[PDB]
Amino acid sequence: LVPVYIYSPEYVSMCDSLAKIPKRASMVHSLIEAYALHKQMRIVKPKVASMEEMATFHTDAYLQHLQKVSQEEYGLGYLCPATEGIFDYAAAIGGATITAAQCLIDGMCKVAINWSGGWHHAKKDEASGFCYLNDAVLGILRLRRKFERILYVDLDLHHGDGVEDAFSFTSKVMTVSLHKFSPGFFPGTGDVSDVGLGKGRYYSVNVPIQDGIQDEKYYQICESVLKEVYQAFNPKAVVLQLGADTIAGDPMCSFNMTPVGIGKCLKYILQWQLATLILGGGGYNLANTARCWTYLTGVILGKTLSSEIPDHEFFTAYGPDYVLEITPSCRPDRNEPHRIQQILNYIKGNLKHVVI
Numbered sequence: 001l002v003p004v005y006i007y008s009p010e011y012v013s014m015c016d017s018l019a020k021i022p023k024r025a026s027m028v029h030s031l032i033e034a035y036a037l038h039k040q041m042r043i044v045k046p047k048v049a050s051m052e053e054m055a056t057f058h059t060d061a062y063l064q065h066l067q068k069v070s071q072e073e074y075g076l077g078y079l080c081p082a083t084e085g086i087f088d089y090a091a092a093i094g095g096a097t098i099t100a101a102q103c104l105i106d107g108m109c110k111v112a113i114n115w116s117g118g119w120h121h122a123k124k125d126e127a128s129g130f131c132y133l134n135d136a137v138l139g140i141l142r143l144r145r146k147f148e149r150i151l152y153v154d155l156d157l158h159h160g161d162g163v164e165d166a167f168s169f170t171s172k173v174m175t176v177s178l179h180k181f182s183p184g185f186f187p188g189t190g191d192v193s194d195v196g197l198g199k200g201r202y203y204s205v206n207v208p209i210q211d212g213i214q215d216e217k218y219y220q221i222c223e224s225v226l227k228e229v230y231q232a233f234n235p236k237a238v239v240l241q242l243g244a245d246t247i248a249g250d251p252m253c254s255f256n257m258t259p260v261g262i263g264k265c266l267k268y269i270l271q272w273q274l275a276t277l278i279l280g281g282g283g284y285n286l287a288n289t290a291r292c293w294t295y296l297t298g299v300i301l302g303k304t305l306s307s308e309i310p311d312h313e314f315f316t317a318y319g320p321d322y323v324l325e326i327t328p329s330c331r332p333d334r335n336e337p338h339r340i341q342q343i344l345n346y347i348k349g350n351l352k353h354v355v356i
Ligand SMILES: CN(C)c1ccc(C(=O)NCCCCCCC(=O)NO)cc1
Pocket: 079, 129, 130, 156, 157, 158, 186, 243, 245, 281, 282, 283
């Protein structure tokens, strides 16, 4: 049947509050609306995550803390300050991801979308990198009720450390993250020699990338890795994290990608035809993130979209040119193709240890 699109007016208003990405949620949805793609999807009201559902991953001590400070010392510092209503926004986004997982279980759909999810840094007892709750972990754990092996792919600019760590000692969930890996660059983990630990050894994969990667070399990397993971690990479902802080024009100022490069990655995964749970993440050039996740939504739906941005609530944000396409910046590509090749070999090596 048709892709699920998780959405409600109130969920969006809630996610709009998030101080680092104000009104992003409305922008993304408004743009998806303007292209009529919600017509071609099933809309499902997210449920709010209960206290017990969040404790499938997070500790009770953490969670009760989060709640208390939401009314008026678990990582709630500079990057995750303890503002009002944060407990509720966290529950909302957690429930939204879980809800999508549920839809995939009940075979309602083969793809389910929560663009406002993708909070990949949160730990069981600590906030991190703007992430107060790990919704990707919550959804993976929900998918494990039905699906034997889960692949978590993370294409955010940043290492999916929170999700990797949660599953670091298990062979039931494999984590693949492609990310900027550089001294000083958050969160600092996920060098190619990071493979997980114990029973989980070889069931974490990390691709370290330098500034200025563009669509071609990026897709070459991504395809090469996923092909191997697919053959070795033979996943029964995919949780996919598509943070748009990789996209040219983002103030993270790092990668030099366009949504076409990412959708080719998404297409690769989609052809496996598994239960796939699609998440957003970072993305701080707000119009650009909307263009990306709108385009990606086109891809999910095998639609080609018109190059001119329809008029809608946030049309002014798309000036001066009002086109869907993003132009690569002229920034240097810092990725030596030798280093990339050793990275790919090192991973191919690693993945030989994975036999199901
Ligand atoms: C005062 N000073 C010199 C500094 C203050 C903050 C940062 C920083 O960490 N910036 C990066 C914030 C991390 C965001 C990661 C969240 C994300 O998009 N994950 O996907 C650096 C220097």
